[PDB]
Short mmCIF file of C-alpha atoms and ligand atoms in Angstrom, two decimals:
data_model
loop_
_atom_site.label_atom_id
_atom_site.label_comp_id
_atom_site.label_asym_id
_atom_site.label_seq_id
_atom_site.Cartn_x
_atom_site.Cartn_y
_atom_site.Cartn_z
CA UNK H 1 77.21 -23.39 12.59
CA UNK H 2 77.18 -25.26 9.26
CA UNK H 3 73.86 -25.23 7.41
CA UNK H 4 72.47 -26.33 4.05
CA UNK H 5 73.91 -24.76 0.90
CA UNK H 6 71.40 -25.32 -1.91
CA UNK H 7 68.30 -24.85 0.25
CA UNK H 8 69.85 -21.93 2.13
CA UNK H 9 70.99 -20.29 -1.12
CA UNK H 10 67.53 -20.64 -2.66
CA UNK H 11 65.83 -19.27 0.46
CA UNK H 12 68.21 -16.32 0.61
CA UNK H 13 67.69 -15.58 -3.08
CA UNK H 14 63.90 -15.64 -2.82
CA UNK H 15 63.92 -13.49 0.32
CA UNK H 16 66.31 -11.00 -1.27
CA UNK H 17 64.01 -10.82 -4.26
CA UNK H 18 61.11 -10.10 -1.91
CA UNK H 19 62.97 -7.23 -0.23
CA UNK H 20 64.10 -5.89 -3.60
CA UNK H 21 60.52 -5.89 -4.89
CA UNK H 22 59.25 -4.22 -1.72
CA UNK H 23 61.92 -1.52 -1.80
CA UNK H 24 61.27 -0.88 -5.49
CA UNK H 25 57.53 -0.58 -4.89
CA UNK H 26 57.89 1.78 -1.93
CA UNK H 27 60.42 3.97 -3.76
CA UNK H 28 58.09 4.04 -6.77
CA UNK H 29 55.17 5.13 -4.57
CA UNK H 30 57.25 7.87 -2.96
CA UNK H 31 58.56 9.17 -6.29
CA UNK H 32 55.11 9.03 -7.90
CA UNK H 33 53.58 11.06 -5.07
CA UNK H 34 56.44 13.56 -4.84
CA UNK H 35 57.49 14.27 -8.43
CA UNK H 36 53.93 14.58 -9.73
CA UNK H 37 52.23 17.88 -8.92
CA UNK H 38 48.64 16.66 -9.38
CA UNK H 39 49.11 14.03 -6.63
CA UNK H 40 49.69 16.49 -3.76
CA UNK H 41 47.29 16.19 -0.83
CA UNK H 42 47.07 15.15 2.81
CA UNK H 43 45.94 11.70 1.68
CA UNK H 44 48.96 11.34 -0.60
CA UNK H 45 51.18 12.63 2.21
CA UNK H 46 49.81 9.84 4.41
CA UNK H 47 50.41 7.42 1.53
CA UNK H 48 54.07 8.43 1.35
CA UNK H 49 54.25 8.19 5.15
CA UNK H 50 53.08 4.59 4.86
CA UNK H 51 55.55 4.08 2.01
CA UNK H 52 58.40 5.34 4.19
CA UNK H 53 57.28 3.14 7.09
CA UNK H 54 57.09 -0.05 5.04
CA UNK H 55 60.26 0.91 3.15
CA UNK H 56 62.07 0.98 6.49
CA UNK H 57 60.34 -2.32 7.29
CA UNK H 58 61.64 -3.79 4.02
CA UNK H 59 65.12 -2.26 4.04
CA UNK H 60 66.50 -2.85 7.56
CA UNK H 61 64.43 -5.34 9.58
CA UNK H 62 63.53 -7.58 6.63
CA UNK H 63 67.13 -8.15 5.43
CA UNK H 64 68.19 -8.85 9.02
CA UNK H 65 65.42 -11.43 9.38
CA UNK H 66 66.42 -12.99 6.06
CA UNK H 67 70.07 -13.21 7.13
CA UNK H 68 69.02 -14.74 10.45
CA UNK H 69 66.98 -17.32 8.54
CA UNK H 70 69.84 -18.13 6.17
CA UNK H 71 72.32 -18.49 9.03
CA UNK H 72 69.79 -20.08 11.39
CA UNK H 73 71.08 -18.02 14.33
CA UNK H 74 71.80 -14.43 15.30
CA UNK H 75 75.19 -13.16 14.12
CA UNK H 76 75.13 -9.42 14.85
CA UNK H 77 75.60 -7.74 18.21
CA UNK H 78 73.14 -7.91 21.08
CA UNK H 79 72.67 -4.15 20.77
CA UNK H 80 71.96 -4.80 17.09
CA UNK H 81 69.40 -7.45 18.08
CA UNK H 82 67.62 -5.01 20.39
CA UNK H 83 67.66 -2.27 17.74
CA UNK H 84 66.36 -4.80 15.20
CA UNK H 85 63.41 -5.72 17.41
CA UNK H 86 62.74 -2.07 18.22
CA UNK H 87 62.76 -1.04 14.56
CA UNK H 88 60.49 -3.96 13.66
CA UNK H 89 57.94 -2.93 16.29
CA UNK H 90 58.30 0.76 15.42
CA UNK H 91 57.63 0.25 11.71
CA UNK H 92 54.81 -2.28 12.16
CA UNK H 93 53.19 0.02 14.76
CA UNK H 94 53.66 3.28 12.84
CA UNK H 95 52.11 1.72 9.74
CA UNK H 96 48.97 0.86 11.72
CA UNK H 97 48.49 4.42 12.99
CA UNK H 98 49.26 5.70 9.50
CA UNK H 99 46.33 3.56 8.40
CA UNK H 100 44.33 4.95 11.33
CA UNK H 101 44.80 8.55 10.20
CA UNK H 102 44.26 7.53 6.58
CA UNK H 103 40.94 6.04 7.70
CA UNK H 104 40.01 9.19 9.63
CA UNK H 105 40.91 11.34 6.61
CA UNK H 106 38.90 9.09 4.30
CA UNK H 107 35.91 9.27 6.64
CA UNK H 108 36.16 13.07 6.61
CA UNK H 109 36.52 13.19 2.83
CA UNK H 110 33.65 10.80 2.14
CA UNK H 111 31.30 12.46 4.63
CA UNK H 112 32.19 16.05 3.62
CA UNK H 113 33.47 16.07 0.03
CA UNK H 114 33.04 19.78 -0.75
CA UNK H 115 34.07 20.88 2.75
CA UNK H 116 36.98 18.41 2.84
CA UNK H 117 39.71 21.00 2.06
CA UNK H 118 38.39 23.23 4.87
CA UNK H 119 38.72 20.51 7.55
CA UNK H 120 41.77 18.35 6.72
CA UNK H 121 44.04 21.21 5.68
CA UNK H 122 47.74 20.92 4.93
CA UNK H 123 48.81 22.21 8.35
CA UNK H 124 46.35 19.98 10.20
CA UNK H 125 47.35 17.00 8.07
CA UNK H 126 51.05 17.41 8.84
CA UNK H 127 50.25 17.98 12.52
CA UNK H 128 48.31 14.70 12.60
CA UNK H 129 51.14 12.93 10.78
CA UNK H 130 53.72 14.15 13.30
CA UNK H 131 51.46 13.22 16.22
CA UNK H 132 51.06 9.73 14.75
CA UNK H 133 54.80 9.31 14.30
CA UNK H 134 55.48 10.43 17.89
CA UNK H 135 52.74 8.21 19.35
CA UNK H 136 53.97 5.24 17.29
CA UNK H 137 57.49 5.81 18.59
CA UNK H 138 56.22 5.98 22.18
CA UNK H 139 54.05 2.87 21.88
CA UNK H 140 56.80 0.93 20.10
CA UNK H 141 59.72 1.67 22.44
CA UNK H 142 57.79 2.00 25.69
CA UNK H 143 57.12 -1.64 26.55
CA UNK H 144 60.46 -2.71 25.05
CA UNK H 145 62.99 -0.15 26.27
CA UNK H 146 61.03 0.66 29.42
CA UNK H 147 59.98 -2.78 30.68
CA UNK H 148 62.91 -4.90 29.51
CA UNK H 149 63.51 -8.44 30.76
CA UNK H 150 66.91 -9.61 32.04
CA UNK H 151 69.31 -9.90 29.13
CA UNK H 152 70.30 -13.43 28.05
CA UNK H 153 73.91 -14.50 28.52
CA UNK H 154 74.16 -15.76 24.91
CA UNK H 155 75.22 -13.34 22.18
CA UNK H 156 73.87 -15.64 19.43
CA UNK H 157 70.27 -15.61 20.74
CA UNK H 158 67.81 -12.97 19.47
CA UNK H 159 64.33 -13.97 20.68
CA UNK H 160 61.00 -12.23 21.31
CA UNK H 161 59.70 -11.31 24.76
CA UNK H 162 57.38 -14.18 25.72
CA UNK H 163 56.18 -12.67 29.01
CA UNK H 164 52.41 -12.02 28.91
CA UNK H 165 52.85 -8.60 30.51
CA UNK H 166 54.62 -7.38 27.38
CA UNK H 167 52.72 -9.24 24.65
CA UNK H 168 49.35 -8.08 25.97
CA UNK H 169 50.39 -4.42 26.07
CA UNK H 170 52.10 -4.57 22.68
CA UNK H 171 49.17 -6.27 20.94
CA UNK H 172 46.67 -3.88 22.55
CA UNK H 173 48.54 -0.66 21.82
CA UNK H 174 49.98 -1.64 18.43
CA UNK H 175 47.29 -3.67 16.65
CA UNK H 176 44.00 -4.14 18.50
CA UNK H 177 43.34 -0.51 19.48
CA UNK H 178 44.43 1.05 16.15
CA UNK H 179 42.63 -1.83 14.45
CA UNK H 180 39.42 -1.03 16.32
CA UNK H 181 39.76 2.63 15.37
CA UNK H 182 40.26 1.65 11.72
CA UNK H 183 37.21 -0.65 11.70
CA UNK H 184 35.04 2.05 13.28
CA UNK H 185 36.19 4.65 10.76
CA UNK H 186 35.72 2.33 7.76
CA UNK H 187 32.31 1.07 8.90
CA UNK H 188 31.36 4.75 9.00
CA UNK H 189 32.94 5.23 5.56
CA UNK H 190 31.06 2.26 4.13
CA UNK H 191 27.68 3.33 5.53
CA UNK H 192 28.18 6.95 4.41
CA UNK H 193 29.29 5.91 0.91
CA UNK H 194 26.37 3.52 0.46
CA UNK H 195 23.68 5.82 1.89
CA UNK H 196 24.92 8.87 -0.04
CA UNK H 197 29.29 14.48 -6.88
CA UNK H 198 32.33 15.19 -9.04
CA UNK H 199 34.43 15.40 -5.86
CA UNK H 200 32.42 12.86 -3.85
CA UNK H 201 33.26 10.20 -6.44
CA UNK H 202 36.96 11.03 -6.17
CA UNK H 203 36.81 10.70 -2.38
CA UNK H 204 34.97 7.39 -2.72
CA UNK H 205 37.60 6.05 -5.14
CA UNK H 206 40.44 7.09 -2.83
CA UNK H 207 38.57 5.50 0.08
CA UNK H 208 38.22 2.25 -1.86
CA UNK H 209 41.93 2.19 -2.69
CA UNK H 210 42.99 2.88 0.89
CA UNK H 211 40.43 0.37 2.15
CA UNK H 212 42.00 -2.30 -0.04
CA UNK H 213 45.39 -1.31 1.40
CA UNK H 214 44.05 -1.49 4.97
CA UNK H 215 42.40 -4.85 4.34
CA UNK H 216 45.63 -6.27 2.97
CA UNK H 217 47.58 -4.96 5.96
CA UNK H 218 45.10 -6.32 8.50
CA UNK H 219 44.89 -9.71 6.80
CA UNK H 220 48.68 -10.00 6.63
CA UNK H 221 49.30 -8.98 10.25
CA UNK H 222 46.32 -10.67 11.94
CA UNK H 223 47.87 -14.17 12.23
CA UNK H 224 50.86 -12.88 14.21
CA UNK H 225 48.80 -10.84 16.68
CA UNK H 226 46.41 -13.80 17.00
CA UNK H 227 49.10 -16.43 17.62
CA UNK H 228 51.37 -14.45 19.97
CA UNK H 229 48.80 -13.47 22.65
CA UNK H 230 47.21 -16.92 22.33
CA UNK H 231 50.62 -18.54 22.69
CA UNK H 232 51.36 -16.54 25.83
CA UNK H 233 47.90 -16.94 27.42
CA UNK H 234 47.47 -20.67 26.71
CA UNK H 235 49.44 -23.85 27.45
CA UNK H 236 50.47 -23.97 23.79
CA UNK H 237 53.47 -21.63 23.51
CA UNK H 238 53.78 -20.80 19.80
CA UNK H 239 53.60 -24.41 18.56
CA UNK H 240 55.64 -25.21 15.46
CA UNK H 241 58.00 -22.25 15.67
CA UNK H 242 58.23 -22.76 11.91
CA UNK H 243 54.61 -21.53 11.75
CA UNK H 244 55.63 -18.61 13.97
CA UNK H 245 58.22 -17.73 11.32
CA UNK H 246 55.59 -18.12 8.58
CA UNK H 247 53.25 -15.69 10.33
CA UNK H 248 56.01 -13.10 10.66
CA UNK H 249 56.86 -13.51 6.99
CA UNK H 250 53.20 -13.21 5.99
CA UNK H 251 53.03 -10.01 8.02
CA UNK H 252 56.15 -8.66 6.32
CA UNK H 253 54.68 -9.55 2.92
CA UNK H 254 52.28 -6.60 3.23
CA UNK H 255 55.22 -4.21 2.89
CA UNK H 256 55.68 -5.49 -0.67
CA UNK H 257 51.97 -6.04 -1.36
CA UNK H 258 51.06 -2.41 -0.64
CA UNK H 259 52.77 -0.77 -3.66
CA UNK H 260 50.90 -3.17 -5.96
CA UNK H 261 47.57 -1.91 -4.62
CA UNK H 262 47.97 1.73 -5.67
CA UNK H 263 48.26 1.11 -9.44
CA UNK H 264 45.91 -1.89 -9.48
CA UNK H 265 43.17 0.10 -7.68
CA UNK H 266 43.73 3.73 -8.76
CA UNK H 267 44.03 4.63 -12.44
CA UNK H 268 45.71 7.91 -11.47
CA UNK H 269 48.41 5.99 -9.60
CA UNK H 270 48.73 3.58 -12.53
CA UNK H 271 49.33 6.49 -14.90
CA UNK H 272 51.82 8.06 -12.49
CA UNK H 273 53.73 4.78 -12.17
CA UNK H 274 53.76 4.32 -15.94
CA UNK H 275 55.04 7.84 -16.61
CA UNK H 276 57.64 7.80 -13.82
CA UNK H 277 59.18 4.49 -14.95
C1 LIG Y 1 54.56 -5.08 15.90
O1 LIG Y 1 54.70 -6.47 15.94
C2 LIG Y 1 55.75 -6.90 16.77
C3 LIG Y 1 56.92 -7.38 16.21
C4 LIG Y 1 57.98 -7.82 17.06
N1 LIG Y 1 59.13 -8.29 16.50
C5 LIG Y 1 60.13 -8.71 17.28
N2 LIG Y 1 61.34 -9.20 16.65
C6 LIG Y 1 61.39 -9.55 15.20
C7 LIG Y 1 62.49 -10.55 14.90
N3 LIG Y 1 62.67 -11.42 15.99
C8 LIG Y 1 62.25 -12.81 16.09
O2 LIG Y 1 62.47 -13.41 17.09
C9 LIG Y 1 61.51 -13.55 14.94
C10 LIG Y 1 60.31 -14.24 15.56
O3 LIG Y 1 60.65 -15.20 16.50
C11 LIG Y 1 61.70 -16.06 16.05
C12 LIG Y 1 61.89 -17.31 16.71
C13 LIG Y 1 62.90 -18.17 16.29
C14 LIG Y 1 63.74 -17.80 15.22
C15 LIG Y 1 63.56 -16.58 14.58
C16 LIG Y 1 62.53 -15.70 15.00
O4 LIG Y 1 62.38 -14.45 14.31
C17 LIG Y 1 63.33 -10.75 17.03
C18 LIG Y 1 62.64 -9.42 17.36
N4 LIG Y 1 60.03 -8.67 18.62
C19 LIG Y 1 58.92 -8.21 19.20
N5 LIG Y 1 58.82 -8.17 20.64
C20 LIG Y 1 57.84 -7.77 18.40
C21 LIG Y 1 56.64 -7.27 18.98
C22 LIG Y 1 55.61 -6.85 18.15
O5 LIG Y 1 54.42 -6.37 18.72
C23 LIG Y 1 53.57 -7.39 19.14
#
């Protein structure tokens, strides 16, 4: 259907700029971790895992959301709508468990600096990464593909499951449980760092950087997981759908915010970014 030109063009341009910045940042993070040989570690492997997750979030789901916004309605196939929702959930739920294992690794490193290489070894790190990716896949496409509501008869409609039975499970298994794990691990990290040398300081600095990243992610994605379950469990059903869109976009903004954090909070990452550009 016809829509605005100037406003739509401006909105599309700004959104495209956002995706371009996010993709550039994630690619920069991946290249900085990979090409450099002094940035190899299980923590940096988890960092590139998060970079891949939010790069997928910025490269496929984000452009589709931007195009939907510009058009005002769904234009692609219904199968494409389902795959779009599934990829959105998969990326936003794999990032959270990536942060969970990053928090576990940072707790191990802060608590046991000297013995850190003997606990979180390369093999164990990759095993944990693969387990996280598999569990994120399962949690993402279980409630959706498994318990799927009757399909709408309109090809132009691409909505979100509003049934409480799905929103409760998705919020619990995607945000609230991994979030609780992350808070437990970082409260432990904070207490251990404060109560507690050349390697301990490095672990503390990495923990601070990844804690900033985790805080940004949680702040960005909290409004959505607070408004969706509330909307389903209360007479108010996502009031001001505009605000519902704003909370999704704020959540997506973390995908672009994250690459800024690594240089601005880790001088090693700043040097790597400077010398890779
Ligand atoms: C991990 O976080 C999750 C993300 C999810 N994402 C989707 N999407 C994203 C895109 N999308 C929209 O409807 C959005 C929002 O609503 C709209 C309303 C009117 C106009 C446009 C709108 O754009 C369709 C599919 N679906 C789910 N079930 C999700 C579940 C999750 O777990 C709790």
